Design an enzyme around this catalytic site. Structure first.
Site, mmCIF file in Angstrom:
data_model
loop_
_atom_site.group_PDB
_atom_site.id
_atom_site.type_symbol
_atom_site.label_atom_id
_atom_site.label_comp_id
_atom_site.label_asym_id
_atom_site.label_seq_id
_atom_site.Cartn_x
_atom_site.Cartn_y
_atom_site.Cartn_z
ATOM 1 N N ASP A 199 0.831 -1.198 0.000
ATOM 2 C CA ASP A 199 0.000 0.000 0.000
ATOM 3 C C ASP A 199 0.867 1.250 0.000
ATOM 4 O O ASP A 199 1.884 1.310 0.704
ATOM 5 C CB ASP A 199 -0.857 0.098 1.271
ATOM 6 C CG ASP A 199 -1.695 -1.143 1.578
ATOM 7 O OD1 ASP A 199 -1.320 -2.278 1.220
ATOM 8 O OD2 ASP A 199 -2.731 -0.962 2.259
ATOM 9 N N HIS A 235 -1.118 4.598 -0.500
ATOM 10 C CA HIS A 235 -2.081 5.530 0.104
ATOM 11 C C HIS A 235 -1.794 7.000 -0.062
ATOM 12 O O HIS A 235 -1.823 7.765 0.896
ATOM 13 C CB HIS A 235 -2.321 5.180 1.571
ATOM 14 C CG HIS A 235 -3.221 3.999 1.749
ATOM 15 N ND1 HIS A 235 -4.484 3.983 1.281
ATOM 16 C CD2 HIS A 235 -3.011 2.765 2.365
ATOM 17 C CE1 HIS A 235 -5.059 2.799 1.582
ATOM 18 N NE2 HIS A 235 -4.157 2.050 2.237
ATOM 19 N N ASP A 288 -4.060 -0.286 -3.221
ATOM 20 C CA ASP A 288 -4.196 0.786 -2.230
ATOM 21 C C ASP A 288 -3.207 1.922 -2.487
ATOM 22 O O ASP A 288 -2.397 2.301 -1.631
ATOM 23 C CB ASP A 288 -4.117 0.251 -0.792
ATOM 24 C CG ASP A 288 -5.409 -0.436 -0.346
ATOM 25 O OD1 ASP A 288 -6.292 -0.681 -1.184
ATOM 26 O OD2 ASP A 288 -5.524 -0.749 0.859
ATOM 27 N N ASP A 338 -6.556 7.074 -1.421
ATOM 28 C CA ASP A 338 -7.240 7.259 -0.134
ATOM 29 C C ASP A 338 -6.253 7.396 1.022
ATOM 30 O O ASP A 338 -5.108 6.946 0.948
ATOM 31 C CB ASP A 338 -8.237 6.130 0.184
ATOM 32 C CG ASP A 338 -9.492 6.157 -0.677
ATOM 33 O OD1 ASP A 338 -9.878 7.214 -1.186
ATOM 34 O OD2 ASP A 338 -10.140 5.090 -0.827
ATOM 35 N N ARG A 339 -6.740 7.996 2.108
ATOM 36 C CA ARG A 339 -5.994 8.180 3.359
ATOM 37 C C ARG A 339 -4.985 9.315 3.224
ATOM 38 O O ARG A 339 -5.138 10.346 3.897
ATOM 39 C CB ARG A 339 -5.343 6.876 3.876
ATOM 40 C CG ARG A 339 -6.282 5.676 3.962
ATOM 41 C CD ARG A 339 -7.341 5.878 5.034
ATOM 42 N NE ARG A 339 -7.966 4.618 5.439
ATOM 43 C CZ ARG A 339 -8.816 4.504 6.461
ATOM 44 N NH1 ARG A 339 -9.153 5.574 7.185
ATOM 45 N NH2 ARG A 339 -9.325 3.311 6.765
ATOM 46 N N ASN A 358 -8.411 -2.904 -2.188
ATOM 47 C CA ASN A 358 -9.785 -2.604 -1.773
ATOM 48 C C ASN A 358 -10.116 -1.116 -1.862
ATOM 49 O O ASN A 358 -11.293 -0.759 -1.975
ATOM 50 C CB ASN A 358 -10.150 -3.195 -0.398
ATOM 51 C CG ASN A 358 -9.340 -2.621 0.728
ATOM 52 O OD1 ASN A 358 -8.124 -2.544 0.647
ATOM 53 N ND2 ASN A 358 -10.018 -2.212 1.805
ATOM 54 N N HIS A 359 -9.092 -0.266 -1.847
ATOM 55 C CA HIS A 359 -9.315 1.167 -2.011
ATOM 56 C C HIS A 359 -9.473 1.648 -3.423
ATOM 57 O O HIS A 359 -9.852 2.800 -3.619
ATOM 58 C CB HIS A 359 -8.258 1.971 -1.271
ATOM 59 C CG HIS A 359 -8.572 2.137 0.191
ATOM 60 N ND1 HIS A 359 -9.310 3.169 0.652
ATOM 61 C CD2 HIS A 359 -8.263 1.347 1.294
ATOM 62 C CE1 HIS A 359 -9.437 3.061 1.980
ATOM 63 N NE2 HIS A 359 -8.795 1.954 2.378
ATOM 64 N N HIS A 378 -3.762 -8.150 -3.291
ATOM 65 C CA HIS A 378 -3.774 -7.130 -2.269
ATOM 66 C C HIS A 378 -4.155 -7.645 -0.898
ATOM 67 O O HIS A 378 -3.456 -7.378 0.101
ATOM 68 C CB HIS A 378 -4.688 -5.988 -2.657
ATOM 69 C CG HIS A 378 -4.748 -4.935 -1.604
ATOM 70 N ND1 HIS A 378 -3.735 -4.067 -1.391
ATOM 71 C CD2 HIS A 378 -5.699 -4.676 -0.629
ATOM 72 C CE1 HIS A 378 -4.036 -3.288 -0.346
ATOM 73 N NE2 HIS A 378 -5.240 -3.647 0.113
ATOM 74 N N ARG A 413 -13.197 -6.953 9.881
ATOM 75 C CA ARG A 413 -13.616 -5.824 9.049
ATOM 76 C C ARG A 413 -15.084 -5.879 8.643
ATOM 77 O O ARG A 413 -15.621 -4.895 8.138
ATOM 78 C CB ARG A 413 -12.768 -5.745 7.779
ATOM 79 C CG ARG A 413 -11.273 -5.724 8.016
ATOM 80 C CD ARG A 413 -10.593 -5.839 6.670
ATOM 81 N NE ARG A 413 -9.145 -5.995 6.726
ATOM 82 C CZ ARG A 413 -8.263 -5.032 6.470
ATOM 83 N NH1 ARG A 413 -8.671 -3.784 6.204
ATOM 84 N NH2 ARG A 413 -6.973 -5.326 6.473
ATOM 85 N N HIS A 462 -2.252 -4.774 2.567
ATOM 86 C CA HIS A 462 -3.585 -4.604 3.196
ATOM 87 C C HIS A 462 -3.598 -4.487 4.714
ATOM 88 O O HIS A 462 -4.645 -4.205 5.294
ATOM 89 C CB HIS A 462 -4.468 -5.750 2.666
ATOM 90 C CG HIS A 462 -5.953 -5.694 2.991
ATOM 91 N ND1 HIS A 462 -6.766 -4.638 2.696
ATOM 92 C CD2 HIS A 462 -6.781 -6.705 3.475
ATOM 93 C CE1 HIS A 462 -8.035 -4.964 3.041
ATOM 94 N NE2 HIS A 462 -8.034 -6.225 3.512
HETATM 95 C C1 LIG Z 1 -4.610 1.065 8.361
HETATM 96 C C2 LIG Z 1 -3.885 0.804 7.086
HETATM 97 C C3 LIG Z 1 -3.495 -0.749 6.985
HETATM 98 C C4 LIG Z 1 -4.086 -0.976 5.583
HETATM 99 O O1 LIG Z 1 -3.902 0.201 4.937
HETATM 100 C C5 LIG Z 1 -4.606 0.961 5.837
HETATM 101 C C6 LIG Z 1 -5.945 0.319 5.822
HETATM 102 C C7 LIG Z 1 -6.797 0.923 4.708
HETATM 103 O O2 LIG Z 1 -6.442 0.749 3.520
HETATM 104 O O3 LIG Z 1 -7.827 1.587 4.963
HETATM 105 C C8 LIG Z 1 -5.570 -1.097 5.651
HETATM 106 C C9 LIG Z 1 -6.163 -1.744 4.399
HETATM 107 O O4 LIG Z 1 -5.430 -1.912 3.377
HETATM 108 O O5 LIG Z 1 -7.373 -2.093 4.395
HETATM 109 MN MN LIG Z 2 -4.549 -0.025 2.724
HETATM 110 MN MN LIG Z 3 -6.338 -2.690 1.702
#
Ligand SMILES: C[C@H]1C[C@@H]2O[C@H]1[C@@H](C(=O)O)[C@H]2C(=O)O
Ligand SMILES: [Mn+2]
Ligand SMILES: [Mn+2]
Length: 325
Positions: free
Chosen positions: A76, A78, A105, A108-109, A137-138, A186, A234, A261
């Protein structure tokens, strides 16, 4: 007088006849480092072209590395654009002799998600057989809506540009297999036994992920240390234990999986007896986590993962999730 008019003199890097080049990429990275914006027409051209490239790929990218050929796998990122540039400074720019896989990923964030994703897409166009992007997933509408990327695209460009990003993300492949031995995705493995590479190839991926099923699991699942499976913490997909990993690897003639992830203080984790590796490439995540990040080196003749840890570098004063809900 002709000298007195202004058109696009001051609007930054331009594609060369609509195409990405190495010079363009170097200009783009500098422009972004200096907190400037890629012209919307260039962004659009990158997106249309990368959609075409990605749409021709299998859901499972199958890559052969020759004996002395290496590759780098990142987790990731981000929207931590300044850390992305740091990866390239630590490990070299992408090229045909320095290939990369970014395992989802991208957005986001972090609040430089546009800069990360357009840089990654530019490199995908420049080195399509040596620069690989897997969906996280993002890279989905529901996540982008809440966690910054939709807000960031709408702030920097328009809603229409965001719609196009969403369409492009739908074509990102879901997994990559190197030399028939290492599988990269991922999230992780599956909520039921007996899934094979065939099932991954068969996923019609040009969509938002389903609420359950193989496409969901690839983007969302996490390893657990005990055998069996659990409903995910989750609320999406499952946790899978070492027996799940091992049964999957054995049936598919694979050695191990690389996934991302989850954040790890050391930037990586080796779990399931070596069978499930996590790599996470966003150091000091959200300016608060204090974690190291890592990337992995692999070689055709030796597919064992070798980890390289790194720490965060300075970035401009924009807060994480500044564009989020
Ligand atoms: C808290 C971080 C760990 C991973 O990246 C962030 C979170 C996120 O993507 O929101 C996780 C994920 O990949 O789902
Ligand atoms: Mn992530
Ligand atoms: Mn993720």
């Amino acid at each position: 007088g002709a000298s007195m008019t202004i058109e696009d003199e001051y609007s930054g890097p331009k594609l060369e006849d609509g195409k990405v080049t190495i010079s363009f990429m170097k200009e783009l990275m500098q422009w972004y480092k200096d907190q400037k914006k890629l012209h919307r027409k260039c962004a659009y051209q990158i997106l249309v072209q990368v959609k075409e490239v990605l749409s021709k790929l299998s859901t499972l990218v199958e890559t052969t590395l020759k004996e002395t050929e290496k590759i780098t796998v990142c987790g990731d990122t981000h929207g931590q654009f300044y850390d992305l540039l740091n990866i390239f400074e630590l490990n070299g720019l992408p090229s045909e002799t320095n290939p990369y896989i970014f395992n989802g990923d991208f957005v986001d964030r972090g609040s430089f998600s546009v800069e990360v994703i357009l840089t990654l897409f530019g490199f995908k166009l420049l080195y399509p057989d040596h620069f690989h992007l897997l969906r996280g997933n993002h890279e989905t509408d529901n996540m982008n809506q809440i966690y910054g990327f939709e807000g960031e695209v709408k702030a920097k460009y328009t809603a229409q540009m965001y719609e196009l990003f969403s369409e492009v993300f739908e074509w990102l492949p879901l997994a990559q297999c190197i030399n028939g031995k290492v599988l990269i995705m991922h999230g992780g493995l599956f909520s039921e036994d007996g899934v094979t590479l065939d099932d991954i190839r068969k996923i019609e991926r040009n969509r938002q992920p389903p609420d359950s099923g193989p496409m969901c699991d690839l983007l969302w699942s996490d390893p657990q240390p005990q055998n069996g499976r659990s409903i995910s913490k989750r609320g999406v997909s499952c946790q899978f234990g070492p027996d799940v990993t091992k049964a999957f690897l054995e049936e598919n003639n694979l050695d191990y999986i690389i996934r991302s992830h989850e954040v790890k203080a050391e930037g990586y984790e080796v779990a399931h007896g070596g069978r499930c590796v996590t790599v996470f490439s966003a150091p000091n995540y959200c300016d608060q986590m204090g974690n190291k990040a890592s990337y992995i080196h692999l070689q055709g003749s030796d597919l064992r993962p070798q980890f390289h840890q790194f720490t965060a570098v300075p970035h401009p004063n924009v807060k994480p999730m500044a564009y989020a809900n």
